[PDB]
Paper text:
Through its engagement with RNAP, Q renders RNAP resistant to terminators. The Q protein of bacteriophage 21 (21Q) was characterized as sharing a conserved mechanism of action with Q proteins from other lambdoid phages. To investigate how Q renders RNAP resistant to terminators, and to visualize sequence-specific interaction of Q with QBE, we determined a crystal structure of 21Q at 1.45 Å resolution and a single-particle cryo-electron microscopy (cryo-EM) structure of an intact 21Q-engaged arrested complex at 4.08 Å resolution.
The crystal structure of 21Q was determined at 1.45 Å resolution. The structure of 21Q contains six helices (H1-H6) and three long loops (L1-L3). Surprisingly, the structure of 21Q is reminiscent of the binary complex structure of σR4 bound to anti-σ RseA. Because H3 and H4 of σR4 form a helix-turn-helix (HTH) motif and participate in the binding and recognition of the −35 element, the corresponding helices of 21Q (H5 and H6) probably participate in the binding and recognition of the QBE. Other than that, there is no structural similarity between 21Q and λQ, which is consistent with the observation that although both Q proteins act by a similar mechanism, there is no obvious homology to their protein sequences.
Author numbering: 7 to 46, 55 to 156
The structure:
């Protein structure tokens, strides 16, 4: 988990970046995931939008599911509850280790809400050091 101040800082940047992405300003070549997402609010400037997009793509490409959830929340502006409702609606049957033995069952809505929150938190944790270093790298060289 990030500290409260680190979260406020990164969440702020991701809100600005998300609005910039949603306005269509990211070139398709810079991220196929973002481009595919966009085929289906104050904003940062273009230099910052590109820098953040390169950071996010370079971190989140490993987990397309989490990447999509990040884009739903920050770019489209969907609430965590709205993302979890759809996540729950399309969820696959899972092997659940219950008391007395395992069973096959689709996850509850409460479980899907917790998982969406955890996925967003884990994504911000991964993004934070890379974005912090990206801004510091730009400052150093320029």
């Amino acid at each position: 988990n990030l500290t409260k101040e680190q979260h406020e800082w990164l969440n702020g940047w991701l809100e600005l970046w998300g609005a910039w992405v949603y306005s269509g300003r990211l070139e398709k070549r810079m991220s196929s995931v973002i481009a595919k997402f966009m085929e289906s609010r104050p904003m940062c400037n273009d230099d910052d939008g590109m820098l953040i997009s390169q950071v996010v793509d370079s971190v989140m490409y490993i987990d397309k599911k989490a990447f999509g959830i990040l884009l739903s929340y920050y770019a489209h502006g969907s609430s965590k509850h709205a993302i979890a409702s759809y996540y729950h609606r399309v969820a696959r049957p899972r092997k659940m280790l219950c008391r007395g033995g395992g069973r096959i069952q689709k996850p509850s809505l409460a479980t899907c809400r917790r998982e969406v929150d955890e996925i967003l938190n884990a994504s911000l944790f991964m993004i934070y050091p890379v974005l912090d270093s990206a801004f510091k790298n730009r400052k150093r060289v320029e």
